[PDB]
A paper describes a structure:
The flavivirus [name] is a ~48 kDa conserved non-structural protein with two conserved N-linked glycosylation sites and six intra-molecular disulfide bonds. [name] consists of the N-terminal β-roll, the middle wing, and the C-terminal β-ladder domains. Two NS1s are assembled into a symmetric, head-to-head dimer through domain swapping of the β-rolls and the extension of β-sheets from the β-ladders. Although not being a component of the virion, [name] represents a marker for host immune recognition and evasion.
Residue numbers in the entry:
A (entry chain A), B (entry chain B): 176 to 351
């Protein structure tokens, strides 16, 4: 009864590309050389549960590995995963139009440094003053780095933290 | 590995209809209160394993309820199920062109009789002499009856057995 309406759900695979689509959700996965989330575009956030009947590869997943959270109608699929990243509970979900993609934000860099901060609330790449933050670090995530493209700028994943920058000046999402 | 080549596999859902397709397999499933196998068309039998990456609703199934056996490249899906039927291990899989459909054979009728024979190898609807066998019985399967349409005639499912036949006249598939 809490599932999204399957009347408008469209899921398809052909070869090495897959799409989990909805009215507002367009979730692309690829095989390279294992299946992973490629990019996603969400225009209307919703809180239903994506039905297993309209989902591919629903076996042996834990909700902690779902890139798009299950509570936000993220599909319970291995196609909704990426190595080195976990569920993005504290992401910039307040925005209306969201694009999830694996690319560095403009004028930014991410480094794999075990001497880096742990996962925390998602950080925007521009200060409240509006200035770019050049250097970011990661402890376990993989490259290219998970990013969020919204109206107000580029948001980085939780695993991605800034280098020698005070996380107190930055803008942080306050949703879960 | 032991999986079918995913390069040519195409699976899609839109609303109440779903297809698990490949080069030789065309498996249609439908939503009618519950997800079930609608019809299937197989032109080349295979012994690979259908990849879960290209399969819908792979969760909480037992292989005994898969209409198309896992060994015969049947998808491990709730879409590959039908109420009152179990895996058709002893089916007419020797034939080249096979169509699975839920309909009575042209000169037969099937009744739900708990006082009927048990599961056995799939039987043709025409004797070796070539005459139709009008009456068949079922104990637990549902209607319409699962049937196989091949070049040599109509084959009934394992759950569907005849009442007035001495088991010697019939044509029995001898493959598993």
């Amino acid at each position: 009864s809490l599932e999204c309406d399957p009347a408008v759900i469209g899921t398809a695979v052909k070869g090495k590309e897959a799409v989990h689509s909805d009215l507002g959700y367009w979730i692309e996965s690829e095989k390279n050389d294992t299946w992973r989330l490629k990019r996603a575009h969400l225009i209307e956030m919703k809180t239903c549960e994506w039905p297993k009947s309209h989902t591919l590869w629903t076996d042996g997943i834990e909700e902690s590995d779902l890139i798009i959270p299950k509570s936000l109608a993220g599909p319970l699929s291995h196609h909704n995963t990426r190595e080195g990243y976990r569920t993005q509970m504290k992401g910039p979900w307040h925005s209306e139009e969201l694009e999830i993609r694996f690319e560095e934000c403009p004028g930014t860099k991410v480094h794999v440094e075990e001497t880096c901060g742990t996962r925390g609330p998602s950080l925007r790449s521009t200060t409240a003053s509006g200035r770019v933050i050049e250097e970011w670090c990661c402890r376990e995530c993989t490259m290219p780095p998970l990013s969020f493209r919204a109206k107000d700028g580029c948001w980085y994943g939780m695993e991605i933290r800034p280098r020698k920058e005070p996380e107190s000046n930055l803008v942080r999402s306050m949703v879960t």
